């Protein structure tokens, strides 16, 4: 487990600039991030176990997202992940 | 930073170290993971904050998070499967 509160709060300021969050709601959001990330990371690790030298790249995360997220959430998440990787490889 | 290069708020470097802690692990796997966690966080917080606003309060509480998730079949199914263990 890792603390993601600062990041959850930065995103809250983007979406609802003048809205706060209670301590218990932030605890639930930290559990949300950690638990979803554990499922993503676990599925990516399972897929990488099939790779000759166990390589993990964005493909294993994309395939995990498609398996784990339902319908439109998966479509949007894939679009967000692909856009972030495109930005990352194009920039320094 | 890797997060700035990716246009993200979520911590790409820390996520990359977590993936390595569990073979070559590309930084793109950490960028893609941070992007999907940031996307899901933004969707949940926006819907919960809209429930807070409709209730004429100034903060998100666990009940607003529950109202958000219950009002979206995809978020409800994702949380149900996460709690179940997939």
């Amino acid at each position: 487990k890792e603390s993601y509160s600062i990041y959850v709060y930065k995103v809250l300021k983007q979406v609802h600039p003048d809205t706060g969050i209670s301590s218990k709601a932030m605890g639930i959001m930290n559990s949300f991030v950690n638990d979803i990330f554990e499922r993503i990371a676990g599925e990516a690790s399972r897929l990488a176990h099939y790779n000759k030298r166990s390589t993990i790249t964005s493909r294993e995360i994309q395939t995990a997202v498609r398996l784990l997220l339902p319908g439109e959430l998966a479509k949007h998440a894939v679009s967000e992940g692909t856009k972030a990787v495109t930005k990352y490889t194009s920039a320094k | 930073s890797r997060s700035q290069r990716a246009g993200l708020q979520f911590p790409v470097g820390r996520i990359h170290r977590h993936l390595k802690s569990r073979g070559r692990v590309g930084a793109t796997a950490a960028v893609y993971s941070a992007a999907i966690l940031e996307y899901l966080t933004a969707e949940v917080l926006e819907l919960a904050g809209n429930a807070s606003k409709d209730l004429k309060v100034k903060r998100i509480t666990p009940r607003h998070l529950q109202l958000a998730i219950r009002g979206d079949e995809e978020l409800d199914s994702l949380i149900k499967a996460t709690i179940a263990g997939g």
Partner: peptide
Amino acid sequence: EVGLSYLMKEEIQDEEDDDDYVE
């Protein structure tokens, strides 16, 4: 610390003493 399973309680009754998260 609050588990994600908190969301699957029949009906969450918000705690009066649920302090504000502080940046």
